[PDB]
Amino acid sequence: LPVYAPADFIPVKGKGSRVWDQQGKEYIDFAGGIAVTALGHCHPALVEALKSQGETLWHTSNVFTNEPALRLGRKLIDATFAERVLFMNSGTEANETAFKLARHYACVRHSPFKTKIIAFHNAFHGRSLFTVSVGGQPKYSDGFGPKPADIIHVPFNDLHAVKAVMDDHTCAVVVEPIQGAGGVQAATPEFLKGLRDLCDEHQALLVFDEVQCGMGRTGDLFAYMHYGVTPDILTSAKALGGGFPVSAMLTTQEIASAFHVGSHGSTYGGNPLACAVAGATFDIINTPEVLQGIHTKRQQFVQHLQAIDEQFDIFSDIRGMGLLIGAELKPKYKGRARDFLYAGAEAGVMVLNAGADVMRFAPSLVVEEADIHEGMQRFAQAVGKVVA
Amino acid sequence: TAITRATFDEVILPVYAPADFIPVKGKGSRVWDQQGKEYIDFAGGIAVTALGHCHPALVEALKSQGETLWHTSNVFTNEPALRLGRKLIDATFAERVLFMNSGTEANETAFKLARHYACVRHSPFKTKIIAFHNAFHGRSLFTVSVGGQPKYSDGFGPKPADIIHVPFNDLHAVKAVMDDHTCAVVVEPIQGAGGVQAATPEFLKGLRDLCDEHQALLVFDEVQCGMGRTGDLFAYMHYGVTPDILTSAKALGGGFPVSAMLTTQEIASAFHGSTYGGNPLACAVAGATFDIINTPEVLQGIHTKRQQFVQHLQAIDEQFDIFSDIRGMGLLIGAELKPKYKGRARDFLYAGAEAGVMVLNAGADVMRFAPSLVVEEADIHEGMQRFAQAVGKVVAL
Ligand SMILES: Cc1ncc(COP(=O)(O)O)c(C=O)c1O
Ligand SMILES: Cc1ncc(COP(=O)(O)O)c(C=O)c1O
Ligand code: NA
Ligand code: NA
């Protein structure tokens, strides 16, 4: 089931979209550490922000505020629906904050009995007990003792099923606008708008988990902007820090006001070092030029994947948005995603899976055209070894 | 627009009430705000900056690894993670280490591991977790439910079940609630947040014996009391009681977000390399931190420095009659306020800040200090004189 590297593949150095291991073997990185290094490895602007803030102040706790956090909060507020933010360390933590907030808001504004959370089969929201129970893979939430209750799962993209389970006792709908791990499946426009309308009807909060699809990944700053559907709460991580552990939960003042002093917290969350790095990342990703390039680069990848399919006949579908790319394997290659991944690594290209039937790509948003061509040539060679 | 204290209220969720001032720079145990006012730091960002601010060795590790490789996913290991794992394994009971970002995440991992180990090695019905009143284990739904402060776990909908709370240091109560359906006892060897209360020796040894009797795992949350804080590398070493699982964070990265779950191979095998995970950058910094903290000289110094603080707190009490008890271990110090000042810890914290010294509380009745483990003697004396002035100002009123 899980993908792990053997003892002879230990990454030691990265620069841009290239990675070297202990043996000095060079790889083209189309995986980004699972869509994390959205500006590649050791990006000079990010290294500069790390080093300069690293000389000044790393940590003070939430007994205090700090300038890099306030600067970053201001940027996120100015660029999105958000009016308030909370910074944490990981996507899992941001989701914990979001889910607790949706629960607490319902409890204090409506009723302590308004507790149901609707989530989706194959969703991934993290590995904490609560977040993995909201996630939609029972294999990952089984076996840890009593799960937090009042979570209902229905199929992704099934609006009827959502309408059927939702009621006045529902506090939230939690959804990834594109399910990254779950086969790179994008919400349909009708489905996502439908969720907004149902949450409005039932006075439930719409929570978008944009940990994977946010911060430029789709070619808009956040996937919600592509759809034009505004959530009540949004979570962000991964690309937000370009490899530095940082995350954010975004909401409105009206919702945030349900939290009081002590309702939530974090030792490291809102760390000046993290926020200086995320500020630098944000300044680069949130530019017309970088967002446009994500679309150009997507089509460069897609054209290679189509060429590979023309030669080898291995894909049934190429999907995703921006530089989150899914390539679904044909029935003749069902369950082979891991083998194409390992073959890719032998050929010097790092890719991902999205379940056993789907190849996933999540390269740097600024991956050079020459790296796209070189890495896709390597991938084509790996494909040739698997099938030919 | 300039960034002010008012900016906080316009930007962050209202879960904190931060100080009037905004620290912009730190070096060692001194910190400066936007106005260039200089403070002595006896708080350490809540026991996190264990080597002070911008320690040259930690800055060097950050910059060196920062120009090399920051990030791998958990598919991979990396040299800094391997090195740090080896250091932790060599120095402790651990045979396996899993790295995460925060103390909350390390505790999630520990509690899920104790649960899953029971499930697969004993019975899916062996689920009870025993924890303690006033415990603090983090803010995720699971960890805050294992935590012993209902105020923090109420109001988020259905809590993960099968968690039983009894009083800290009450061994009989533990004996009474434990049974063959118990998977774990979770305990902070010293409850930091909970008034700086240390386990008694008989209590902690008692937990080990009861866990053995009932085939449950003993989980030590050393997020706050670990990584040198007590003057041993981990508090368990002071006590001579070996847990099955231990969690570490805060001091581990000296200010960089990093955490660790330590256990044996037998237990770790229930999860389906001696190390798992670990951000390269985080682990490089934590490795540099470990290299300094795990030295005879630094660990001895922690005890010297504790007595320098304690002598000051004693002098303050002699002059102002404010403390009923001075407690904790190493450079985790609690000073309990006398009944006349019950509930007024925040007043002394604010007066401290006005006087230019950063301190903590541990509930409304207890002052808490958690300075850099290498805080200079000159800073201890200066900061404690500032604190004496703050106490003087409060008591004069
Ligand atoms: C949609 C989604 N949410 C949450 C998470 C958890 O984030 P983290 O791994 O930063 O804890 C992930 C990680 O893959 C993700 O893909
Ligand atoms: C004993 C203990 N455990 C766990 C935590 C949670 O750590 P974090 O805030 O890094 O998630 C804390 C934080 O204060 C703590 O004191
Ligand atoms: Na806004
Ligand atoms: Na060992």
mmCIF file of C-alpha atoms in Angstrom, chain A residues 253-366:
data_model
loop_
_atom_site.group_PDB
_atom_site.id
_atom_site.type_symbol
_atom_site.label_atom_id
_atom_site.label_comp_id
_atom_site.label_asym_id
_atom_site.label_seq_id
_atom_site.Cartn_x
_atom_site.Cartn_y
_atom_site.Cartn_z
ATOM 1 C CA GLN A 253 -14.829 38.278 11.611
ATOM 2 C CA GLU A 254 -18.385 37.116 12.354
ATOM 3 C CA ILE A 255 -17.263 33.467 12.493
ATOM 4 C CA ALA A 256 -13.929 34.102 14.213
ATOM 5 C CA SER A 257 -15.753 35.965 16.994
ATOM 6 C CA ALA A 258 -17.206 32.614 18.144
ATOM 7 C CA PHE A 259 -13.734 31.839 19.475
ATOM 8 C CA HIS A 260 -12.784 33.515 22.749
ATOM 9 C CA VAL A 261 -9.382 33.834 24.398
ATOM 10 C CA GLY A 262 -8.317 30.237 25.062
ATOM 11 C CA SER A 263 -10.711 28.487 22.621
ATOM 12 C CA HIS A 264 -7.715 27.375 20.562
ATOM 13 C CA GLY A 265 -3.976 27.893 20.530
ATOM 14 C CA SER A 266 -0.515 26.805 19.439
ATOM 15 C CA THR A 267 3.025 27.090 20.757
ATOM 16 C CA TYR A 268 4.720 27.547 17.378
ATOM 17 C CA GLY A 269 1.747 28.636 15.269
ATOM 18 C CA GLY A 270 2.265 32.183 13.870
ATOM 19 C CA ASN A 271 6.018 31.854 14.296
ATOM 20 C CA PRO A 272 7.905 34.948 12.912
ATOM 21 C CA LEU A 273 10.358 32.749 10.992
ATOM 22 C CA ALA A 274 7.595 30.704 9.333
ATOM 23 C CA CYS A 275 5.623 33.821 8.500
ATOM 24 C CA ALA A 276 8.637 35.614 6.989
ATOM 25 C CA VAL A 277 9.190 32.637 4.684
ATOM 26 C CA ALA A 278 5.475 32.354 3.833
ATOM 27 C CA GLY A 279 5.374 36.114 3.145
ATOM 28 C CA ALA A 280 8.204 35.735 0.609
ATOM 29 C CA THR A 281 6.407 32.756 -0.980
ATOM 30 C CA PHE A 282 3.108 34.614 -1.117
ATOM 31 C CA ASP A 283 4.742 37.657 -2.763
ATOM 32 C CA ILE A 284 6.009 35.472 -5.626
ATOM 33 C CA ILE A 285 3.008 33.178 -6.108
ATOM 34 C CA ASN A 286 0.434 35.983 -5.980
ATOM 35 C CA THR A 287 1.613 37.702 -9.180
ATOM 36 C CA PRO A 288 -0.137 37.771 -12.541
ATOM 37 C CA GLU A 289 2.999 36.411 -14.214
ATOM 38 C CA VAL A 290 3.453 33.350 -11.978
ATOM 39 C CA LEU A 291 -0.240 32.453 -12.042
ATOM 40 C CA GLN A 292 -0.296 32.752 -15.858
ATOM 41 C CA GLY A 293 2.843 30.578 -16.135
ATOM 42 C CA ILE A 294 1.153 27.825 -14.125
ATOM 43 C CA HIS A 295 -1.336 27.469 -16.988
ATOM 44 C CA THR A 296 1.382 27.516 -19.638
ATOM 45 C CA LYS A 297 3.354 24.902 -17.762
ATOM 46 C CA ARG A 298 0.296 22.717 -17.178
ATOM 47 C CA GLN A 299 -0.222 22.438 -20.918
ATOM 48 C CA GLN A 300 3.459 21.575 -21.407
ATOM 49 C CA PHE A 301 3.051 18.636 -19.041
ATOM 50 C CA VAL A 302 -0.315 17.655 -20.536
ATOM 51 C CA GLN A 303 1.122 17.591 -24.074
ATOM 52 C CA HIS A 304 3.857 15.204 -22.904
ATOM 53 C CA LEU A 305 1.358 12.993 -21.128
ATOM 54 C CA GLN A 306 -0.742 12.907 -24.298
ATOM 55 C CA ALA A 307 2.341 12.004 -26.368
ATOM 56 C CA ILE A 308 3.196 9.224 -23.898
ATOM 57 C CA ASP A 309 -0.359 7.929 -24.198
ATOM 58 C CA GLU A 310 -0.146 8.053 -28.000
ATOM 59 C CA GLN A 311 3.011 5.892 -27.924
ATOM 60 C CA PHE A 312 2.148 3.511 -25.059
ATOM 61 C CA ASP A 313 -1.668 3.605 -24.609
ATOM 62 C CA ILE A 314 -1.651 3.796 -20.810
ATOM 63 C CA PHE A 315 -4.032 6.630 -19.768
ATOM 64 C CA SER A 316 -7.794 6.852 -19.709
ATOM 65 C CA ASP A 317 -7.969 10.443 -18.450
ATOM 66 C CA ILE A 318 -5.768 13.479 -17.778
ATOM 67 C CA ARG A 319 -7.287 15.831 -15.216
ATOM 68 C CA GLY A 320 -6.681 18.234 -12.337
ATOM 69 C CA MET A 321 -6.224 21.997 -12.454
ATOM 70 C CA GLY A 322 -3.141 24.135 -12.921
ATOM 71 C CA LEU A 323 -0.092 22.248 -11.719
ATOM 72 C CA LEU A 324 -2.025 19.576 -9.853
ATOM 73 C CA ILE A 325 -2.134 16.954 -12.641
ATOM 74 C CA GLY A 326 -3.774 13.520 -12.532
ATOM 75 C CA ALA A 327 -3.298 10.846 -15.172
ATOM 76 C CA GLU A 328 -5.608 7.890 -14.681
ATOM 77 C CA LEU A 329 -4.358 4.476 -15.852
ATOM 78 C CA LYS A 330 -6.363 2.376 -18.306
ATOM 79 C CA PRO A 331 -7.991 -0.822 -17.028
ATOM 80 C CA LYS A 332 -5.080 -2.895 -18.430
ATOM 81 C CA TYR A 333 -2.856 -1.047 -15.942
ATOM 82 C CA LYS A 334 -5.196 -0.923 -12.955
ATOM 83 C CA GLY A 335 -3.244 -0.944 -9.685
ATOM 84 C CA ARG A 336 0.077 -0.152 -11.367
ATOM 85 C CA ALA A 337 0.578 3.447 -10.222
ATOM 86 C CA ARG A 338 3.263 2.505 -7.713
ATOM 87 C CA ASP A 339 5.181 0.598 -10.386
ATOM 88 C CA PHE A 340 5.205 3.606 -12.720
ATOM 89 C CA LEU A 341 6.364 5.746 -9.786
ATOM 90 C CA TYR A 342 9.282 3.441 -8.945
ATOM 91 C CA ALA A 343 10.159 3.123 -12.634
ATOM 92 C CA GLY A 344 10.096 6.903 -12.828
ATOM 93 C CA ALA A 345 12.590 7.126 -9.936
ATOM 94 C CA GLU A 346 14.914 4.640 -11.679
ATOM 95 C CA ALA A 347 14.718 6.866 -14.794
ATOM 96 C CA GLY A 348 15.551 9.975 -12.686
ATOM 97 C CA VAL A 349 12.105 11.563 -12.298
ATOM 98 C CA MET A 350 10.104 11.926 -9.086
ATOM 99 C CA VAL A 351 6.332 11.633 -9.482
ATOM 100 C CA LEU A 352 3.327 10.851 -7.255
ATOM 101 C CA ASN A 353 0.320 8.585 -7.094
ATOM 102 C CA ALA A 354 -3.274 9.435 -6.193
ATOM 103 C CA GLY A 355 -4.358 5.967 -5.280
ATOM 104 C CA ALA A 356 -3.262 2.781 -7.046
ATOM 105 C CA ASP A 357 -4.749 3.732 -10.475
ATOM 106 C CA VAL A 358 -3.705 7.374 -10.871
ATOM 107 C CA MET A 359 -0.390 9.148 -11.545
ATOM 108 C CA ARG A 360 -0.098 12.562 -9.904
ATOM 109 C CA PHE A 361 2.211 15.488 -10.663
ATOM 110 C CA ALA A 362 2.664 18.521 -8.428
ATOM 111 C CA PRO A 363 5.859 20.265 -9.554
ATOM 112 C CA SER A 364 7.166 23.701 -8.593
ATOM 113 C CA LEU A 365 4.861 26.416 -9.900
ATOM 114 C CA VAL A 366 7.975 27.937 -11.491
#
